[PDB]
Design a protein around this ligand. Structure first.
Ligand code: CLA
Ligand code: CLA
Ligand code: CLA
Ligand code: CLA
Ligand code: CLA
Ligand code: CLA
Ligand code: CLA
Ligand code: CLA
Ligand code: CLA
Ligand SMILES: CC1=C(C/C=C(\C)CCC[C@H](C)CCC[C@H](C)CCCC(C)C)C(=O)c2ccccc2C1=O
Ligand code: SF4
Ligand code: SF4
Lengths: 137, 74, 46, 139, 74, 753, 65, 80
């Protein structure tokens, strides 16, 4: 078990920072949250360790939350792009956003982790290697 | 080592991967690319292929090694 | 007026609306919940 | 010798240098329907005469630019010729080479430096190592 | 002396690393012929160079965005 | 009869249909995008009106309408400064205590800890200390309360709307003909007598009737609330009579040419007001009144419609041999004949001249406003004084480069060889090798005899041989000619003898005559010149001459050179003419502007560095009760600025302590922007050092990955064009360097100024 | 191939290698590259048409009707 | 001197000949294309290497190629 990291409320250096902090919106509540939940080093500043079986939700929640949002943006853009490929003038739909098409892409992208799974299972996620422009070797 | 050492090692990893990217891209594209399919016939070190096809400054494999020295020094 | 609506769907115009909306959401999150940090999100105020 | 009278020009610093007297020189001659102002290849404005004209130029590109972009395109003059003059006095007519402009196909012109394949079929330089043959010159 | 020796050998190491890839690119143009290397492991590398370069670009982008972003956040 | 107004009626319908057609102004761009280069080309050619159409009349109408739009933008910006100075400022507190309150007109919200930037500027106010000098300008205008600033803000918005309506009206409703724009004589008469002349007269009226009485009371020490409103000085004539007795006899002296009785409020003193450190407002009132008369008289110089006046064409046709001076007859028998054709058709040529003279005007603004501070409590506000000089120096440099840029555009596009046959323009092009070769040599001579002498000093100092240095204590280089001018100008007012007897005080105390202190700080004192000033001035001569060499080579060779004779056909802005002829990269006139921007930045950076160090070292400081002055850097300039190790240590390293230690304080924004400028400078280096061939090939592999996942865009990604990459590199380079100096200057002056 | 056919380019040095084009016309003479193919994506020179031989094309979709 | 080669993919559009600033190229009779003509480079000694011909070539890939070689007075574009 890591011993150089202790709870911030028990760190004398962190406490010194808490008293010397300005009395504004930016410090009153945040220091109280840091003292209860964060682990502080010898410098008195919160540190984020990845060596604890506990507080694993503190790692997985921000990671999963980002990965869902980033995948949502990516799947929205991908589905919209494939929808405009069947148009006569796909370039004009990239400088002029087709709002009915964009809303449809955004609505479906809510379930992107499921959509991507069936996309990969059915083989529709990727194009074949020989059907892709490549440079001479 | 602490948090300060964590960030600088990841900065070093960024430098290693970009310098490798510049060198590997230059080596693998040395024989040719979409912009210049016949690069192998012009040799390792040549200035360019002219302003045509959009412009081809620093297109030779020598230029990738030229660019990689900047990233290696960084 | 239909030309104005078409102009509003331009890529720079839509991107500006999207960035402004996202910045507004992020800004109000800082105002309502300042000092949020990894290991602190979605936890009650002590 | 080359006949023709030089255009009205007060002088300039873009004219001939030691290379003209030592290595080679170029002369462009043409005929114009009237006296008119044209731009010198190396800056400045000159007045071309009524009859046949003769201009001394340092480089062949000066004659091609003057004859092509100005004489033909602007003044509708198509009888211009470019000569290469050596210091010993030898003069040879080089443009147009056979009396017909190069952009117009002419019978009797042979194929020069023609490769009987597409550019993507050039051999790799490895197969021609130490042979002294470039891939584009390979048979 | 310790500072000089570490900096000396690290910088020389960077130059040698650049040279290894520089002459790798020279090999592709001058010494590599696809006929005698048809189907082998060296030929396979050239056949998926786009995947290699694009993934190296992704690692470089990920490291650069997050390392710089966390530095300026601090 | 010749000068008359002719317009078209409804030449362009007012419809938003073309708003949904990006690139409609260009034939190539109208087809729509196929690659990402289309997007960049759309913005690059947006305001290149002469490429939208070949009709000069239509081009001129676009110029006139767009200028109204820019005026509206300026009015909105001006309205913002007045409104922020009336709603989020400490202007009223500053007016009560000008010497003890830092001006501030920007207040930040409190969301992410950025409220730490609300500095304690005094007067019970928290905000960012402004360095624009708005408070000092408003005080000199007689403004004393935030309500007057609020009214000016409303007026600025109204004028912005009027400007916007004028541009729409004069393009979509009543567009003047080409002949209307070609009225040189009418335009010169109206802009001299009516714009400059009547504006000076109007401001002289405001100064006499409003600014002078309010500021006279302010310097007397009476409170703000006891000062009557400016209109009371107009209604109650007795109030003006008490301050200035000459107002008791009305306008009679003016109409009888007895102007000497107006000397009590139209003064000719010179020097500075001891109370505030600025120029006497009565001096400026007579200055602007004299300017109004001179400009109005100048406005009756050109012949419009009544036979009286001078003609532009007749002068230019007459300025030739043998009508010139005997030693000036070399301009040839044609001379200025044919130049009138340039001003008939070339907008770019006029823009070239006007951008140059805006550089001249802004440089005069920078130099003449620190040595003769015109606003009250401006000289002692060191943060504002440094910012104002630096800002207007930089504006001038960009304007000068723009003048050279559009001079080259005129040569490529508007120059006609038929119009210039043996005239001065033709002759100048015909000895361009004479001009450039001599300019190249003098640049080399200046570089050796200005910068290499600094290197000589560094080597001598490192050797421990100070006696061999170029310094006041070694081998002296006294600027005797500049020292002589200071003595002549000081002795002219009585402080080659008394050549300006009517001036009481020295025109500028920088030339000598004494010291002025206001709030325990030096406003202006004599600026002695020694070896260090000799060296730094010839550094400026070197950098300016090289910048001239880069730009003037581009203009003189824009049509072509011995290397590429047909550059005019290639255009003003092209990347190269291939790797042939040994390599023809950056031969275009645009690339000479691109290179000239770097040299303008290098030249002007040393100009503002020279000003910042010299003023801190030898002028600015605090004065004790005994009259002894301790300067901000304690006289470092004489001994430390003669080596660039001294510049590196005693100027860059030492004076960056404020910006480098500004974290966890109200100046922390300057510390952040100090790093921000450093980042952008390094960021620009890859656009400048690399080429698009590498980046296009790299994009090929990235495109392959998107193709693999069926997410490739229809608008094909392309690397930036060769010219575009250069433009990005120079833009980020200049932004990074200038922002770095901006944070460095402002952080130090906000702390020690 | 024939007019209106959908083809895949097999010329290695072509910008449209392994890409898809539409046949615009076929020349019946004995010229080396009689088939004219048009593409939706322009190459680096802005050109969206090229001439190919029969052995450099792969038929992937017959022309309509 | 530079080396200019013309490959069989030429369509005889004469664009390269028109773009040459030193008259290196000319159009000669041919039977490999519909235009019944092909580009030729008889005067490569006057070639400066500007690669204007390659820019004008519409074929993909290029039917005319310029390989920079030994540098002479006229290939360097020297008026002195
Ligand atoms: C005395 C008459 C007069 C005055 C004052 C002006 C003033 C101006 N002209 Mg102008 N002009 C005139 C006559 C006049 N012109 C004539 C007769 C012609 C035909 C030959 C032109 C042709 C002309 C062209 C082609 C262009 C101008 C432009 C300009 C502007 C230059 C930018 C500047 O300095 O901003 C000065 C900044 C200001 C805020 C000045 C105030 C602006 C308003 C419009 C002035 C209104 C004054 C009016 C008398 C009301 C006074 C109220 C009160 C004081 C009593 C400026 C506003 C340029 C421009 O930008 O156009 C928009 C331009 O391109 N003029
Ligand atoms: C009265 C001033 C004035 C006017 C009317 C013009 C007008 C013109 N100029 Mg010009 N110019 C000026 C001053 C002026 N210039 C100055 C002072 C310089 C020196 C820097 C130049 C340098 C210059 C060059 C080098 C070129 C022109 C060109 C042009 C023409 C096309 C305009 C264009 O490309 O749109 C402008 C379109 C843009 C996309 C530019 C905007 C991008 C800027 C650089 C961003 C600036 C950064 C910002 C201020 C700070 C950071 C922002 C933040 C978000 C980080 C047009 C006739 C071009 C041309 O073809 O002329 C025929 C051309 O090649 N000018
Ligand atoms: C449409 C959305 C979209 C999607 C799904 C992808 C997907 C991918 N990109 Mg990518 N990219 C995009 C847009 C997108 N890109 C744009 C707009 C740019 C230009 C800035 C790039 C520039 C880019 C580079 C330079 C690289 C990738 C790479 C990659 C791959 C892995 C890394 C990654 O996710 O990118 C991370 C994301 C970025 C680098 C920038 C994209 C962020 C943009 C601003 C989001 C745009 C969202 C869009 C506007 C949504 C509109 C939809 C609406 C109409 C409904 C992956 C295949 C890498 C690769 O090849 O790995 C193998 C790589 O090197 N991309
Ligand atoms: C900053 C990087 C760096 C540093 C600190 C060192 C440090 C050292 N090197 Mg070194 N070296 C480096 C990079 C570096 N090396 C690189 C990149 C090369 C390849 C060219 C070499 C090649 C090299 C050789 C060939 C030798 C050393 C030696 C030494 C040692 C004695 C020299 C000394 O005091 O330091 C060096 C101190 C410096 C300030 C470095 C700059 C020196 C000059 C000014 C650089 C410019 C060279 C010249 C003026 C320009 C061309 C002419 C020392 C351990 C010597 C040794 O082994 O000792 C027995 C020796 O003989 N080095
Ligand atoms: C054992 C090590 C080794 C060996 C045997 C070689 C051998 C070779 N290299 Mg190579 N190289 C090496 C290490 C090595 N390299 C490293 C470490 C790098 C990375 C920097 C490179 C980068 C490199 C490039 C980029 C190129 C070569 C090339 C070549 C070949 C021709 C050499 C040349 O251009 O003429 C002799 C070259 C010189 C004498 C260069 C001048 C000196 C340079 C500019 C350094 C500047 C001097 C400096 C101020 C002081 C140095 C000390 C002084 C005493 C010189 C040759 C087969 C070239 C080639 O094959 O072309 C196809 C080529 O283009 N190499
Ligand atoms: C400070 C200098 C600097 C910086 C920051 C970069 C940054 C980068 N270089 Mg680079 N380079 C530089 C100098 C620099 N270079 C120099 C001097 C050279 C020598 C010529 C090179 C040569 C070079 C090569 C040869 C290559 C790179 C590559 C890269 C990228 C890989 C790193 C990455 O993806 O991180 C993430 C990206 C960044 C850190 C960039 C900054 C992102 C900003 C901060 C986002 C801000 C967004 C914000 C809204 C913008 C404000 C609005 C604004 C538009 C007005 C990255 C964009 C490689 C590449 O493209 O790989 C994909 C590559 O192949 N560079
Ligand atoms: C010679 C011209 C000149 C000078 C020296 C001054 C001087 C002054 N004015 Mg003033 N002004 C002028 C013309 C001038 N004005 C004109 C024409 C107008 C509009 C019609 C105004 C309107 C005005 C207002 C509204 C205010 C001032 C104020 C001031 C004072 C503040 C300092 C300042 O403005 O910078 C001094 C400026 C300079 C040293 C240089 C700028 C002068 C012009 C632009 C240069 C023109 C020459 C040019 C480069 C060459 C042309 C080419 C050639 C072929 C002819 C100061 C006493 C302020 C005040 O009250 O102070 C207390 C104030 O509020 N002025
Ligand atoms: C150019 C703008 C301008 C304007 C609008 C005014 C307006 C005015 N002046 Mg005035 N004045 C001006 C310039 C101006 N002045 C200048 C430049 C001088 C210096 C010669 C004077 C010297 C002056 C005197 C000496 C007096 C006025 C007075 C007046 C007022 C009555 C004048 C009248 O109707 O007869 C009136 C408010 C008279 C007044 O009522 O005093 C307040 C008065 O006695 N003015
Ligand atoms: C500190 C870096 C630096 C230096 C020293 C130079 C030096 C020079 N540049 Mg330059 N330049 C630079 C950076 C630099 N540049 C950058 C970053 C850019 C990009 C914008 C440019 C862009 C640029 C352009 C566009 C132009 C120049 C020009 C010039 C020359 C001006 C004439 C001159 O001063 O001659 C005197 C030479 C010097 C002052 C150099 C230093 C000499 C040292 C101090 C003394 C040496 C003593 C002795 C001779 C050593 C010999 C010993 C032996 C063993 C070797 C000169 C060679 C101009 C030119 O060629 O005009 C004629 C020109 O047109 N440069
Ligand atoms: C880096 C580089 C490139 C690559 C740069 C490219 C392709 C331009 C990329 C521009 C991007 C797409 C603009 C948008 C970038 C923003 C930071 C995105 C903001 C996203 C928000 C969500 C924050 C060149 O093309 C080039 C060409 C010639 C000489 C030098 C260079 C050069 O140095
Ligand atoms: S600008 Fe680029 S393409 Fe043009 S000659 Fe130079 S390196 Fe070659
Ligand atoms: S430009 Fe290309 S296709 Fe046209 S004639 Fe020349 S080589 Fe043949």
């Amino acid at each position: 078990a890591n011993s150089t990291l202790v709870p911030c409320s028990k760190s004398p250096a962190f406490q010194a920072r808490m008293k010397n902090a300005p009395d504004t919106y930016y410090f009153n509540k945040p220091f109280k949250a840091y003292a209860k939940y964060e682990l502080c080093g010898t410098d008195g500043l919160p540190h984020l360790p990845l060596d604890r079986l506990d507080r694993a939700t503190d790692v997985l929640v921000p990671i999963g939350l980002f990965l869902y949002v980033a995948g949502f943006i990516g799947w929205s853009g991908r589905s919209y792009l494939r929808a405009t490929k069947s148009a006569s003038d796909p370039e004009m739909k990239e400088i002029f956003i087709d709002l009915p098409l964009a809303l449809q892409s955004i609505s479906k992208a809510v379930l992107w982790p499921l959509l991507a799974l069936q996309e990969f299972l059915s083989g529709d996620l990727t194009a074949r290697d020989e059907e892709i422009p490549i440079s001479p070797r | 080592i602490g948090p300060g050492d964590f960030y600088v090692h990841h900065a070093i990893a960024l430098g290693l991967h970009v310098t490798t990217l510049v060198l590997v891209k230059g080596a693998l594209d040395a024989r040719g690319s979409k912009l210049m399919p016949d690069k192998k016939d012009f040799g390792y070190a040549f200035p360019c292929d002219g302003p045509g096809r959009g412009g081809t400054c620093d297109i030779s494999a020598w230029d990738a090694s030229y660019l990689a020295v900047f990233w290696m020094l960084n | 007026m239909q030309h104005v609506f078409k102009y509003l769907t331009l890529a720079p115009v839509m991107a500006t609306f999207t960035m402004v909306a996202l910045s507004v959401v992020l800004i109000m999150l800082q105002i309502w919940f300042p000092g949020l940090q990894y290991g602190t999100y979605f936890k009650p105020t002590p | 010798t080359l006949e023709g009278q030089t255009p009205i020009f007060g002088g300039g610093t873009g004219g001939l240098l030691t290379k003209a007297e030592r290595e080679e020189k170029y002369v462009i001659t043409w005929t114009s329907p009237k006296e008119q102002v044209f731009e010198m290849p190396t800056g400045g404005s000159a007045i071309m005469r009524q009859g046949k004209n003769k201009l001394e130029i340092a480089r062949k590109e000066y004659g091609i630019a003057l004859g092509g972009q100005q004489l033909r395109a602007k003044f509708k003059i198509n009888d211009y010729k470019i000569y290469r003059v050596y210091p010993n006095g030898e003069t040879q007519m080089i443009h147009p080479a056979d009396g017909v402009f190069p952009e117009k196909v002419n019978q009797g012109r042979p194929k020069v430096r023609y490769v009987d394949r597409n550019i993507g079929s050039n051999p790799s330089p490895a197969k021609l190592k130490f042979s002294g043959v470039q891939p584009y010159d390979a048979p | 002396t310790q500072a000089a020796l570490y900096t000396h050998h690290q910088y020389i190491a960077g130059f040698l690393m650049v040279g290894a890839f520089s002459h790798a690119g020279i090999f592709w143009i001058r010494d590599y012929d696809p006929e005698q290397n048809k189907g082998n492991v060296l030929d396979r590398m050239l056949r998926h160079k786009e995947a290699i370069i694009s993934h190296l670009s992704w690692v470089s982008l990920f490291l650069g965005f997050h390392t710089l972003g966390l530095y300026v956040h601090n | 009869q010749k000068v008359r107004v002719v317009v078209d009626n409804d030449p362009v319908p007012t419809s938003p249909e073309l708003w949904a057609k990006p690139g409609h102004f260009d034939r190539t761009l109208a087809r729509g995008p196929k690659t990402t280069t289309w997007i960049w080309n759309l913005h690059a050619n947006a305001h290149d009106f002469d490429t939208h159409t070949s009709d000069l009349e239509d081009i001129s109408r676009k110029i006139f309408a767009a200028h109204f739009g820019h005026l509206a933008v300026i009015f909105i910006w001006l309205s913002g400064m007045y409104f922020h100075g009336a709603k989020f400022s400490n202007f009223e507190a500053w007016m009560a205590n000008p010497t003890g309150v830092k001006p501030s007109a920007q207040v930040v919200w409190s969301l992410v800890g950025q409220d730490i930037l609300n500095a304690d500027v005094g007067g019970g106010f928290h905000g960012i200390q402004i360095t624009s000098g708005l408070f000092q300008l408003w005080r000199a205008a007689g403004i004393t309360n935030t309500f007057q600033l609020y009214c000016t803000a409303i007026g600025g918005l109204v004028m912005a709307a009027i400007m916007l309506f004028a541009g729409w009206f004069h393009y979509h409703k009543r567009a003047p003909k080409l002949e209307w724009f070609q009225n040189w004589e009418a335009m010169m008469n109206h802009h001299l007598a009516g714009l400059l002349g009547l504006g000076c007269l109007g401001w002289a009226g405001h100064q006499i009737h409003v600014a002078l009485p309010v500021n006279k009371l302010l310097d007397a020490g009476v409170a703000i609330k006891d000062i009557p409103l400016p209109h009371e000085f107009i209604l109650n004539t007795s109030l003006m009579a008490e301050l200035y007795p000459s107002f008791a006899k009305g306008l009679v002296p003016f109409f009888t040419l007895q102007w000497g009785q107006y000397a009590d409020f139209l003064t000719f003193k010179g020097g500075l007001n001891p109370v505030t450190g600025g120029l006497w407002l009565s001096d400026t009132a007579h200055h602007h009144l004299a300017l109004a008369v001179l400009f109005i008289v100048a406005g009756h110089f050109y012949r419009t419609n009544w036979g009286i006046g001078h003609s532009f064409k007749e002068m230019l046709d007459d300025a030739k041999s043998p009508n010139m001076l005997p030693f000036l007859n070399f301009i040839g028998p044609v001379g200025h004949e044919g130049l009138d054709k340039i001003f008939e058709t070339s907008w770019h040529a006029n823009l070239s001249i006007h951008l140059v003279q805006f550089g001249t005007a802004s440089l005069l603004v920078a130099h003449h406003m620190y040595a003769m501070p015109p606003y009250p409590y401006l000289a002692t506000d060191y943060a504002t004084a440094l910012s104002l000089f630096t800002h207007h120096v930089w504006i001038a440099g960009f304007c000068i480069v723009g003048g050279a840029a559009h001079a080259a555009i005129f040569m490529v596009r508007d120059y006609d060889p038929a119009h210039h046959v043996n005239n001065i323009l033709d002759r100048t092009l015909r000895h361009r090798d004479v001009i450039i070769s001599h300019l190249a040599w003098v640049c080399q001579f200046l570089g050796f005899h200005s910068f290499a002498m600094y290197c000589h000093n560094d080597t001598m100092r490192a050797f421990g041989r100070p006696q061999d240095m170029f310094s006041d204590t070694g081998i002296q280089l006294q600027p005797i000619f500049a020292q002589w001018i200071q003595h002549i100008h000081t002795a002219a007012v009585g402080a080659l003898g008394t050549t300006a007897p009517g001036i009481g005080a020295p025109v500028s105390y920088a030339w000598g005559g004494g010291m002025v202190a206001v709030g325990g700080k030096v406003a202006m004192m004599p600026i002695a010149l020694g070896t260090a000033d000799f060296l730094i001035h010839h550094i400026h001569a070197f950098t300016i001459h090289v910048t001239v060499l880069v730009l003037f080579k581009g203009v003189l060779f824009a049509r072509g050179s011995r290397l590429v004779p047909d550059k005019a056909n290639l255009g003003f802005r092209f990347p190269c003419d291939g790797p042939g002829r040994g390599g023809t990269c950056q031969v275009s006139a645009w690339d000479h502007v691109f290179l000239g921007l770097f040299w303008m930045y290098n030249s002007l950076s040393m100009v503002v560095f020279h000003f910042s160090w010299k003023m801190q070292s030898d002028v600015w400081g605090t004065v004790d009760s005994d009259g002894i002055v301790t300067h901000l850097t304690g006289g470092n300039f004489a001994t430390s600025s003669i080596t660039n190790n001294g510049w590196l240590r005693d100027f860059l390293w030492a004076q960056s302590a404020q910006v480098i230690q500004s974290y966890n304080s109200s100046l922390s924004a300057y510390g952040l922007m100090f790093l921000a400028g450093h980042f952008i400078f390094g960021f620009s280096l890859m656009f400048l050092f690399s080429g698009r061939g590498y980046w296009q090939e790299l994009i090929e592999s990235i495109v392959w990955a998107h193709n693999k996942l069926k997410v490739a865009p229809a608008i094909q990604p392309r690397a930036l064009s060769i010219v575009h990459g250069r433009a990005v590199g120079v833009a980020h380079y200049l932004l990074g360097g200038i922002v770095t100096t901006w944070a460095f200057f402002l952080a130090r002056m906000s702390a020690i100024g | 191939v024939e007019r209106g056919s959908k083809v895949r380019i097999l010329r290695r040095e072509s910008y449209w290698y392994q890409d898809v084009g539409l046949v615009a016309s076929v020349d019946k003479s004995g010229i080396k590259y009689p088939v004219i193919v048009r593409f939706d994506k322009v190459n680096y020179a802005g050109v969206n048409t090229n001439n190919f031989a029969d052995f450099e094309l792969l038929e992937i979709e017959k022309p309509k009707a | 001197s530079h080396t200019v080669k013309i490959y069989d993919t030429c369509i005889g559009c004469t664009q390269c000949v028109r773009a040459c600033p030193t008259d290196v190229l000319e159009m000669v009779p041919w039977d490999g294309c519909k235009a019944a003509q092909i580009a030729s480079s008889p005067r490569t000694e006057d070639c400066v290497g500007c690669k204007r011909c390659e820019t004008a070539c519409p074929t993909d890939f290029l039917s005319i190629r310029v390989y920079l070689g030994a540098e002479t007075t006229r290939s360097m574009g020297l008026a002195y």
